[PDB]
Amino acid sequence: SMQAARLAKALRELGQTGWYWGSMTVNEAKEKLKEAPEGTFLIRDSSHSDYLLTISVKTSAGPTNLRIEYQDGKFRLDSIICVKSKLKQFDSVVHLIDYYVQMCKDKRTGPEAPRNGTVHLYLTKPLYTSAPSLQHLCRLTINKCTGAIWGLPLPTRLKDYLEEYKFQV
Amino acid sequence: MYVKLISSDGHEFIVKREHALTSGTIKAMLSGTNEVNFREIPSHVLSKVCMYFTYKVRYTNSSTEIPEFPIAPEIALELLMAANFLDC
Amino acid sequence: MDVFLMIRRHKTTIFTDAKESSTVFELKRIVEGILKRPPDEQRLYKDDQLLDDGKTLGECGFTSQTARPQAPATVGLAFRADDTFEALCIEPFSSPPELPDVMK
Numbered sequence: 001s002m003q004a005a006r007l008a009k010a011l012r013e014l015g016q017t018g019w020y021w022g023s024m025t026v027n028e029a030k031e032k033l034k035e036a037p038e039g040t041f042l043i044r045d046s047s048h049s050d051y052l053l054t055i056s057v058k059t060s061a062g063p064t065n066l067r068i069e070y071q072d073g074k075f076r077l078d079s080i081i082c083v084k085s086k087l088k089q090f091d092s093v094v095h096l097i098d099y100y101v102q103m104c105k106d107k108r109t110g111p112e113a114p115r116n117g118t119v120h121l122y123l124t125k126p127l128y129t130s131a132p133s134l135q136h137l138c139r140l141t142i143n144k145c146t147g148a149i150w151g152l153p154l155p156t157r158l159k160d161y162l163e164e165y166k167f168q169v
Numbered sequence: 170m171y172v173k174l175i176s177s178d179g180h181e182f183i184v185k186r187e188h189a190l191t192s193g194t195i196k197a198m199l200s201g202t203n204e205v206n207f208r209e210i211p212s213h214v215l216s217k218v219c220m221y222f223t224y225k226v227r228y229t230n231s232s233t234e235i236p237e238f239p240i241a242p243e244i245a246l247e248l249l250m251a252a253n254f255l256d257c
Numbered sequence: 258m259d260v261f262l263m264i265r266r267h268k269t270t271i272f273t274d275a276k277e278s279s280t281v282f283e284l285k286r287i288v289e290g291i292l293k294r295p296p297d298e299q300r301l302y303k304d305d306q307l308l309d310d311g312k313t314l315g316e317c318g319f320t321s322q323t324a325r326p327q328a329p330a331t332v333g334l335a336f337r338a339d340d341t342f343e344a345l346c347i348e349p350f351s352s353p354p355e356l357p358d359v360m361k
């Protein structure tokens with residue numbers, strides 16, 4: 001199944017992030033984010049039977065948790081919080097995070113909440129489980145400068161590596 | 170205890186041996202003199218690779234919140250080729 | 258607590274670390290172990306200012322926030338050549354190429 005293949009790829013990408021904490025409990029996440037700056041976030045397995053993954057993020061009021069729904073091959077933010085048409089869908093969960101991160105970096109949304117009930121997710125910087133490899137830190141920097149990696153002056157082997165993870169976070 | 174890493178333009182970088190073993194490539198030569206001469210990595214790249222060694226070793230765990238590792242856009246293409254050559 | 262450093266002379270760069278409470282003299286003792294020159298044959302600089310052997314690294318201006326693993330602070334090194342101390346001379350690293358247009 002193309003959908004099975006899209007799910008296995010999303011899980012591969014997640015393992016490349018350096019900020020996927022696997023089977024961390026909701027209280028372990030509360031402890032780890034307690035001292036972090038507002039917007040610091042991580043992804044972890046959900047404790048809930050019906051969900052694969054949950055975002056944990058530091059707000060100014062303390063760490064909070066947002067589940068990620070996966071339904072018929074698309075990821076989106078937990079649909080209990082808003083109408084589904086306002087929760088953009090993604091084939092990839094890292095792409096989902098990247099989107100909302102890029103919304104905040106581009107100052108299209110800020111730490112204040114909207115008054116009209118649309119989605120409020122303030123994400124700044126991920127919490128790494130461990131230091132990423134230097135190759136991957138280089139990859140992130142190149143993605144932050146361009147998406148046109150195939151015109152870069154690099155060997156095909158290193159373009160193939162860039163193509164495996166096109167995200168900016 | 171320390172090893173010496175030499176760039177293509179002749180800079181000598183002295184780093185803790187435990188730190189250099191971050192590189193899979195250096196790990197092979199050093200486990201298999203105590204100098205390594207990189208004929209194709211220039212000093213502006215090699216110096217940053219050595220900072221990466223310090224940062225990987227300090228932040229191997231999450232006991233401390235892991236800060237970001239800054240990388241100037243201008244070096245990222247060679248740094249990536251260097252990182253791939255060194256396997257780190 | 259910890260400060261991370263590059264001790265630099267000509268084309269030599271030492272990556273090492275110390276504590277904010279470490280003294281300049283302890284740093285020269287690290288240099289002696291690696292470069293084999295006693296501390297009384299050494300001078301250490303933060304920028305163009307000589308560091309007094311009896312001061313802590315914190316007292317010289319090296320804090321943990323400005324001397325990070327990923328961005329270590331530079332200490333300049335000058336050896337004693339016979340009677341006279343050499344001038345502080347640190348050779349620049351090579352210059353990075355110009356950024357390709359797609360990345361500009």
Ligand SMILES: C=CCc1cc(CNC(=O)[C@H](Cc2ccc(OP(=O)(O)O)cc2)NC(=O)Cc2ccc(F)cc2)ccc1F
Nearest residue numbers: 026027030046047048054063064065066067081120121122
């Ligand atoms: C920027 C703002 C993010 C945001 C937040 C919400 C609402 N969010 C919740 O009300 C979640 C519900 C939940 C709780 C646990 C959980 O974890 P798991 O999936 O593993 O069961 C998953 C979800 N409540 C909590 O966080 C309360 C809590 C916190 C810490 C702790 F130690 C125990 C409980 C909606 C939209 C948003 F944009």
